[PDB]
Design a protein around this ligand. Structure first.
Ligand SMILES: NS(=O)(=O)N1C[C@H](C(=O)Nc2ccc(Cl)cc2)[C@@H](C(=O)Nc2ccc(-n3ccccc3=O)cc2F)C1
Ligand SMILES: [Ca+2]
Ligand code: NA
Lengths: 234, 50
C-alpha cells in the first residue's frame, strides 16, 4: 500500500497473507469462512508451495493471534490467463479450519444484484495489505489499509494501456499518491454498507503504483459470486 | 429499494412491488424485519473488538 495508514487491532480482520517457502509474504488473501480464502489466480504462479498466515499485523514480530494454515485444495478460475489478467480469481480450501478471534474474522459475501446496484455504487472501498509502500520499493512489515474511491469504468478504460473487462473494476486516485501496490495483490477490497463490510474486489493489477493518470484494477467479485459459492461447496 | 435501501440493514430486494430485507450468512433478520442480528461472536464483515 502506497500512502494510507497502518490498520489498528481488529480493523482489517479478514486479511490473509500468502507466505512462500522463505516464510516471506508475496500476496494477500481474504478470509471468506473458516475453511476458505479468496485470492487472485495470478498469485498462484509466484510460489510453487505456499501457506496462509492469518492474524498478523507486523511481519517482524510474532504476536498473539497469528496462525499458519496449509492449503488443501487450490481452485483457480479456469479462464484466467496472464495475456489479459481477466478472471483473476482463486479460492483456497485450507486443511484445517480457522478459529475466528480478535484480528481474524471473515468479510461478508453480498448477494449479486444488490451488490451491483447498492455496493458498487458507493463512493469508496477499502483496500489493505503488506505490499510495497512505493513502486518498486520495499514491502511493508506492517498491515496497511487505504480508502479508495470507485472510479468510472470509462475514465479508467481511457487511462489504461490494457483492456478493462467486465470482470474488473477500477478504484483509486488520478494524481494523489495513494494506491495499492505489488504484494497487496490477491488481497481484499471491501465496501462498507451501514456497519457491515462486504468483499467487493480482489487486488489485481496496476501500471506502476500510484502513477499519475493511472488507477488500481480489481477483480469484480460480484461477477464471480456464483463461481465462489460453487467453489466453496467442494 | 432505490432509496434508504428499503430501510434494510443489509440486503434489500423488491418482491411483488414490496420491500424484503435479508442478511448475510451468520446473521438473522430482526423482529422489525429490517435489522440483522449476528448469530455468533465473530459474524462476517464486522471489525473485531477486545
Ligand atoms: N514492481 S512494481 O512496479 O511495483 N509492480 C507494480 C504493479 C502492480 O501490480 N500495481 C498495482 C497497482 C494497484 C493495484 Cl489495485 C494492484 C497492483 C506491477 C505490474 O506492472 N502489474 C501488472 C501490470 C499489468 C498487467 N496486465 C494487465 C492487463 C493485461 C495484461 C497485463 O500484464 C498485469 C500486472 F500484474 C509491477
Ligand atoms: Ca507478526
Ligand atoms: Na493514479
Amino acid at each position: 500500500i502506497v500512502g494510507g495508514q497502518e490498520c489498528k487491532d481488529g480493523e482489517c480482520p479478514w486479511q490473509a497473507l500468502l507466505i512462500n517457502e522463505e516464510n516471506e509474504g508475496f500476496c494477500g488473501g481474504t478470509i471468506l469462512s473458516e475453511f476458505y480464502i479468496l485470492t487472485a489466480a495470478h498469485c498462484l504462479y509466484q510460489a510453487k508451495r505456499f501457506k496462509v498466515r492469518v492474524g498478523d499485523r507486523n511481519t517482524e514480530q510474532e504476536e498473539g493471534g497469528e496462525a499458519v494454515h496449509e492449503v488443501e485444495v487450490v481452485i483457480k478460475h479456469n479462464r484466467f490467463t496472464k495475456e489479459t489478467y481477466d478472471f483473476d480469481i482463486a479460492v483456497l480450501r485450507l486443511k484445517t479450519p480457522i478459529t475466528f478471534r480478535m484480528n481474524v474474522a471473515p468479510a461478508c459475501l453480498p448477494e449479486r444484484d444488490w451488490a451491483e446496484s447498492t455496493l458498487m455504487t458507493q463512493k469508496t472501498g477499502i483496500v489493505s495489505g503488506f505490499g510495497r509502500t512505493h513502486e518498486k520499493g520495499r514491502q511493508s512489515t506492517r498491515l496497511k489499509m487505504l480508502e479508495v474511491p470507485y472510479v468510472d469504468r470509462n475514465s479508467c478504460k481511457l487511462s489504461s494501456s490494457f483492456i478493462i473487462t467486465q470482470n474488473m473494476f477500477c478504484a483509486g486516485y488520478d494524481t494523489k499518491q495513494e494506491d495499492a501496490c505489488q504484494g497487496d495483490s490477491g488481497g481484499p477490497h471491501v465496501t462498507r454498507f451501514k456497519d457491515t463490510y462486504f468483499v467487493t474486489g480482489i487486488v489485481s493489477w496496476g501500471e506502476g503504483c500510484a502513477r499519475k493518470g493511472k488507477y488500481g484494477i480489481y477483480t469484480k467479485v460480484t461477477a464471480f459470486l456464483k463461481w465462489i459459492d460453487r467453489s466453496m461447496k467442494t | 429499494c432505490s432509496l434508504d435501501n428499503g430501510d434494510c440493514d443489509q440486503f434489500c430486494h423488491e418482491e411483488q412491488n414490496s420491500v424484503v430485507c435479508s442478511c448475510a450468512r451468520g446473521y438473522t433478520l430482526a423482529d422489525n424485519g429490517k435489522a440483522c442480528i449476528p448469530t455468533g461472536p465473530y459474524p462476517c464483515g464486522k471489525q473485531t473488538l477486545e
